[PDB]
Design a protein around this ligand. Structure first.
Ligand SMILES: C[C@H]1CC(C)(C)N(C(=O)CN2C(=O)c3ccccc3C2=O)c2ccccc21
Ligand SMILES: C[C@H]1CC(C)(C)N(C(=O)CN2C(=O)c3ccccc3C2=O)c2ccccc21
Ligand SMILES: *[C@@H]1O[C@H](CO)[C@@H](O)[C@H](O)[C@H]1NC(C)=O
Ligand SMILES: *[C@@H]1O[C@H](CO)[C@@H](O)[C@H](O)[C@H]1NC(C)=O
Ligand SMILES: *[C@@H]1O[C@H](CO)[C@@H](O)[C@H](O)[C@H]1NC(C)=O
Ligand SMILES: *[C@@H]1O[C@H](CO)[C@@H](O)[C@H](O)[C@H]1NC(C)=O
Ligand SMILES: *[C@@H]1O[C@H](CO)[C@@H](O)[C@H](O)[C@H]1NC(C)=O
Ligand SMILES: *[C@@H]1O[C@H](CO)[C@@H](O)[C@H](O)[C@H]1NC(C)=O
Ligand SMILES: *[C@@H]1O[C@H](CO)[C@@H](O)[C@H](O)[C@H]1NC(C)=O
Ligand SMILES: *[C@@H]1O[C@H](CO)[C@@H](O)[C@H](O)[C@H]1NC(C)=O
Ligand SMILES: [Ca+2]
Lengths: 468, 468, 468, 468
């Protein structure tokens, strides 16, 4: 053995854990934050031009976007000379191919215009949706910047923005490899109005490859034009590692991946034989409730890890033609998904360690604890949970039209979590509503602690009496 | 059944709750925050002109106000051309009618000037009050900007400002529909001094209507001139929705309103029949103490909801003449009142859900919990409540002449709530008073926790000992 | 009772309390914060000139001080014309008399210069002290700006600065009533070097009087020149009220003062007759320990209230000659002292209210507690009190040369109070020391909570066990 | 003894403590923070030149570094004239000798370049390491700025930077004593490219000596060039005190040092005679464990102190030749080490005071206090400790490529300590990941408090049952 059985289970668990830790350490590159930070500082913090003070992070109108797209954008994207024409950003980043700019727009006449306001206003442009999307050519046709291209022909996928979710098709244009031609193309796009009252979003896409450390970086700047006015920017910088098997460390990581696959295969084959007939109530004590989930997530990882590594050359064929736009959005998306899945799996694997330290003599210390709150901490918490949601609803209804922290109801939830801890922005809350604001704040911060003390006293009293 | 009776009460309560939730979701428009945020950024954050850095949010003198009123105000209010003379703000907002500027001022000679300073100073202008208000013409009469107009003729109401509450009458002027004429009028107002040492407040009012989503926005910029000097700005943007019954969703909301009225009528008739003779002590257990309040607030809502929907066309008759100033202050005020009332009602309805969950075996968990502490938390808390107010009084007397967070005594209360949580501005507190400041801070944060621990220990001791 | 005796004591206490509350409300003027805020914004936030961005609050060198003293200082102090020569600040503040500028400096040759660095360094100027103070004339004598004047002839007193405490004598100059002559005088002072390597402090003093609300404001700007280099500014704006008995409210306040004096005389005579022979152990139960202190502080107030109101005309004689510098420093100092004393007295009077509420059935709720935690909280807290001071000493020794929050050891104490609550500036702490910083932070925040939990658990265990 | 023995132990402990406190007060100079603050403000906050807004603290490119090194650096380092050529910074700091600039760089061709990207990329420059370091001359040789000099010939040591640890050798150049020649040298270095794609770090070193208070200040500005691009600055200002025995206070401190040596000798001899044969289990009670750490730290501190006080003149021989670069890095390093050691020793000495207070009737309060939790708080805390590290691992894996607070895994630990207290930067966390961010935040802040409350309930119940 019994002790021998638990000891062999322990040792195989530590081998699994150390393999997973090695994999995570290897996959996590060192000092990769500074790469993205330099990219973001270059493309987001420099003023759009010498005179005015606004940058991409603080954009307010369409003219600001036009100034940015021919000002700081071209200056930070095409670097003159190293001492050919390759545009090594920061002298060592090698802008790949050409950037691409894309526009999404809707149709005129998409309201039910009020009859009273019919002789003054003549046209509408509703908020973005697939039903309101425009598909007709406009302006001087003369190319692909004025002709709709479907999401299948326009080789790409959708994207989830702040205001809505965008299709991934529309009117696009591929810029050139040098500064002068891109400047001319942007000037032509500005002369013949390309953004006029129907535009709902604009994407800018490009990618660079640092050679000193082999890492690609995918940049997707997005500017959203609401139906009300103004702009809303977003950047989403993301590094990638496509070319692998360069040093012995890479082969070591590949071997670690193979042995991890063997480990999880052994776990799943051993777990399934333990649920066959014996222990039909196997899903209890919650420890089992974890150990299946692990392998589940594990196999999902393999899926992604197989679906994204075997489809790089079919997309890295850009190497044969360095004069087009390389699509790297899918690789970045799947890299992000794999990162999230791996982080969740390692977190759960780490917390599964308690299964073994319990075998000693921590039953009372732990056992008792986890058993003395199943219907106590989770039984008295219904009242605070209801009051929390009621206060969130009240805050969302009162505020949320004046305060950014109280729009988008779910965010209100988070805001309350930051009010209890001490992250408060009371100035704007009080400014928005001079009567209900302070009342809400004081009543919330008082009632939360009052009911928490009631909970604690009730647990103490009740428990004591029960064990008296 | 008895169980059947509580079950039918439960089901009717959930129907009422779902109807109320549908009403609140429908009345709360989506992404309406960005409309106000764009408006405020355009009219508050842009510098008053190209050279100096000050904006409306940071105004300091009368000359700054004069620069703003002919600089960033006109630039962000009259937009040149879309590719007529209609000034579509952000190309899609349609400034309605003309803006209006109004001034409130007091009379010379309103002190009891000290006899010693009688040959040194000659004139006074007291703080604003209805008793000190001026009503005589001044300067070149030549119109309504130099002649007092009563609050009845000047079609409007009062307003509650930071310093005082203002009447709503005074000297007003209606600007024009184009940039040149308004610029000329403002230049004429500046030449023949319109603001001179007697002015106490200045209002700027206008409204826009977005057609893509039918919403009005009412803007009322206010600048207060204290008797001491300087200016104090206030903006108070507010979106409004007048034209309804546009899509089927609006008719669905109307049906929801009707059925909600029926629901609350049923509730009130049931309450009044249950309060007739039996249970003359009906106002106990506190649950009843809530269920009447609900219907009370409910009927109040209807009042507002009826008093503001039937008085739109008598005020929207602006549609027949698009060359005057449309008064929308009353509609915005009543919309705000309705929003507050509805939020409070839904909060109370949500917290009334506990009445049913206690019928299960949870009733023994809120005995001690919601009972017991009736005279324990509410009995031991008199000492902390007194100490809190004593510290607030001390802080208001010591500080409050140097620190903005400690003026206006009630605000001191709120400041203390932010000191316990962790929102502290210790730099200015210590700078204002280098001896009493730190002493107050440390003694407050120590004594609060000390007395809280004493409360908790005393409650534990009494509970245990009492039931020992 | 007996009940009749406690009832008459209660009613006389509430009469005393309401009299004190009326006095405090009357003495606390309304919206007096905005006066000081406008003054400080005008004299501290405006840039020293159009081109440079630095202001008085952020000064770094002597040239910056020279730019300020002939730039924003003169611009915000002499206002051209209202539509004579009176300089109404903000058109309504009436600069009184003339401003005065004063300098304090030390003697050359006040080191014990190291023998090694004797051929490279020739002169010293030690830190400021009365022993190192200079008293000899320098430069072109030609007036009082280059001749030392004693603290008795130079009619004034000392001042407590950030670096040291300054005497109040030195080299002074009285400016003029108009802009041109003061500009000429400052230019002459700058030409013939007035600040050169020996200057240790510089004071600028003036005062204004608002006529709409009778209030004086005393301004004393101070710039300190350390022995190391640079400057350190301080402002100390203070509103003052000299001319009283203007409206009936003032006479009401005078009557309230008289009746308060009668009240405290009655209290002190009752206290002294209650201590004659009976109750030689009178100083117990701590309630008596309060009620004498009250009257003590009370009489002190009268002293100040009599020492500052009877010496106004002997100093307001400025009214007969409006061409000199009016000394108002003493009046402001005594006003501040009176404010502090009054605030402390009202705080103690307010907390003395518990003496009556305990006579009811509440005596069993705090009798127990105030005979219990007496040696439990005040006996178990010696360990946290020692650990707190040890950590403060460690932080002061490690930091304090790089971080402003950890110099001046007492301030370290306050910083720790802000770390527990959540006011943290971890960036600079970690930057100053990359190894000891985080170690100190984590160990402090862990050990504090650990020992607090041990304290509370020990009290619980001890209590229960004791009364088992 | 017995009481006599503990009393003599007490009195000798207080003599030791007062001697140590005197030493710490003496070694800690007063108002030495302002010296470093002025230096840092002068050399870090001034813009690199008049037009652009960037300073040393915010540098982004190589051109910014070149602008700084001939702009604000020369302006704040060579001061024109006092009313010779000595460059008294702030007129009273006496720049010592000449500054020195040093560069570290790597070799071309240090990748394993992918075969696919072989016709597009030609050269590499790996991250800095001793293996990749370059040692060949480059450019026009013509001096020592283009020729490698070993760490032994280049008289200096290593340094621990943000990105890596640097050797201390490389290509250096000694500037001149006047502004014109240094400007010419920097212009020549900029013309013939000195920083080109291989540079990995750059050091600037100089030192000043204030004569009014005898203190040296050592400045070492460092700029790191990552393999990705951009720059990362660091300053590390440090005041130093070399010339001692100037006043009687210095001799008093020397006598204190000698007597403190005598105290530790007496303590160590007593401890060694108390461990000879009797009490072979001597290492218990935590006092017998603390008092040996005390003496170990003390002897280490004195070893360091006597190692650095006798190693000054062989390095201060700069006095004979004021035309070279004085090396003060070692003295500053050992001063920092001594300060850290002394602070730790005094902290431990202060906390050792508890040994005596428990001899009174307080020992019954320290029993439960310091034991009833030996296996109770340290036994129930394994679960929170594991969950904390699991959450840190999850945060480091998810974030850390987008957020500066979540890179460098150990820092994540500290970040969590600041989230519980209330120091939160939720905006960037939510922006980096819009799904996992809020989930991580809410789950962490909920589970931490849940587990803490569970611990407290479990320990209370357990203790109660045990002593039932
Ligand atoms: C500027 C100022 C102007 C104004 C009159 C619209 N405003 C309110 O009116 C708020 N407000 C209530 O809720 C309220 C409730 C019961 C009686 C009186 C009032 C009352 O007067 C308000 C509300 C929030 C922030 C500023 C303001
Ligand atoms: C920039 C960097 C440079 C430098 C080498 C002086 N620096 C330290 O050296 C700190 N430091 C210790 O305490 C320490 C303690 C035991 C072994 C090694 C070290 C060790 O290396 C330090 C200390 C605080 C902030 C930055 C720095
Ligand atoms: C298409 O026509 C527009 C407007 O005449 C012109 O600006 C553009 O250059 C044309 N493009 C081509 C490819 O001819
Ligand atoms: C989509 O993929 C095909 C496959 O080769 C490619 O030829 C085409 O150019 C892509 N579409 C683009 C890049 O718009
Ligand atoms: C009224 O008189 C003033 C001053 O003479 C002048 O500026 C203004 O234009 C006049 N207004 C009218 C309507 O005549
Ligand atoms: C007040 O209301 C009446 C009602 O029609 C209107 O005629 C009048 O113009 C209003 N007053 C104004 C707009 O000043
Ligand atoms: C004193 O002499 C200085 C220098 O010669 C001169 O600037 C100043 O004006 C003189 N003052 C008087 C009062 O003559
Ligand atoms: C000090 O007080 C006396 C008393 O009248 C006055 O004459 C003298 O001018 C004062 N000293 C000054 C203002 O420097
Ligand atoms: C070395 O040569 C370079 C380039 O010709 C020149 O700039 C530099 O001044 C020369 N140095 C010396 C010491 O001759
Ligand atoms: C290193 O020390 C020696 C010892 O005198 C000295 O001569 C030499 O100049 C130093 N190296 C430098 C300063 O680069
Ligand atoms: Ca907090």
């Amino acid at each position: 053995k019994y002790l021998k059985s638990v000891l062999r289970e322990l040792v195989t668990y530590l081998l699994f854990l150390i393999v997973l830790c090695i994999l995570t350490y290897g996959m996590m590159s060192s000092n990769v934050y500074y790469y993205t930070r330099m990219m973001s500082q270059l493309f987001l913090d420099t003023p759009v031009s010498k005179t005015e003070k606004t940058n991409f992070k603080t954009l307010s109108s369409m003219e600001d976007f036009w100034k940015f797209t021919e000002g700081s954008l071209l200056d930070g994207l095409y670097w003159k000379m190293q001492p050919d024409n390759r545009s090594f950003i920061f002298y060592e980043n090698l802008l790949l191919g050409v950037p691409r700019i894309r526009q999404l727009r809707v149709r005129n006449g998409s309201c039910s215009i009020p009859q009273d306001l019919r002789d003054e206003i003549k046209e509408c442009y509703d908020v973005y949706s697939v039903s309101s999307e425009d598909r007709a050519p406009f302006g001087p046709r003369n190319g692909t910047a004025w002709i709709y291209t479907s999401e299948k022909d326009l080789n790409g996928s959708s994207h989830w923005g702040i205001i809505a979710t965008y299709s991934g098709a529309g009117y696009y244009l591929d810029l050139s490899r040098t500064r002068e031609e891109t400047a001319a193309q942007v000037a032509s796009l500005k002369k013949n109005v390309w953004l006029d009252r129907g535009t709902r979003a604009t994407f800018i896409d490009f990618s660079v490859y640092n050679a000193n450390i082999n890492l690609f970086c995918v940049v997707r700047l997005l500017v959203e034009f609401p139906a009300t006015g103004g702009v809303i920017p977003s950047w989403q910088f993301q590094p990638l590692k496509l070319i692998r098997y360069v040093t012995t460390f890479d082969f070591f990581l590949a071997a670690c991946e193979i042995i991890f696959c063997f480990f999880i295969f052994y776990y799943v084959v051993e777990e399934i034989l333990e649920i066959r007939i014996h222990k039909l109530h196997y899903f209890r004590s919650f420890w089992n409730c974890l150990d299946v989930v692990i392998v589940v997530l594990s196999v999902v990882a393999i899926g992604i890890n197989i679906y994204r590594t075997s489809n790089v050359e079919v997309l890295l064929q850009f190497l044969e033609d360095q004069n087009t736009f390389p699509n790297f959005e899918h690789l970045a998306y799947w890299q992000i998904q794999f990162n999230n899945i791996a982080a969740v799996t390692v977190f759960f694997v780490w917390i599964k360690l308690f299964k073994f330290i319990n075998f000693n003599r921590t039953m009372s210390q732990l056992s008792t604890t986890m058993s003395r709150c199943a219907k106590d901490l989770f039984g008295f918490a219904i009242m605070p949970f209801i009051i929390f949601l009621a206060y969130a609803q009240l805050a969302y209804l009162v505020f949320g039209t004046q305060v950014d922290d109280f729009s988008t109801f779910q965010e209100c939830i988070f805001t309350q979590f930051r009010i209890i801890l001490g992250d408060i922005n009371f100035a704007e809350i009080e400014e928005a509503n001079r009567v209900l604001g302070p009342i809400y704040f004081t009543t919330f911060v008082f009632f939360m602690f009052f009911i928490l003390l009631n909970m604690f006293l009730a647990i103490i009293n009740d428990t004591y009496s029960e064990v008296k």
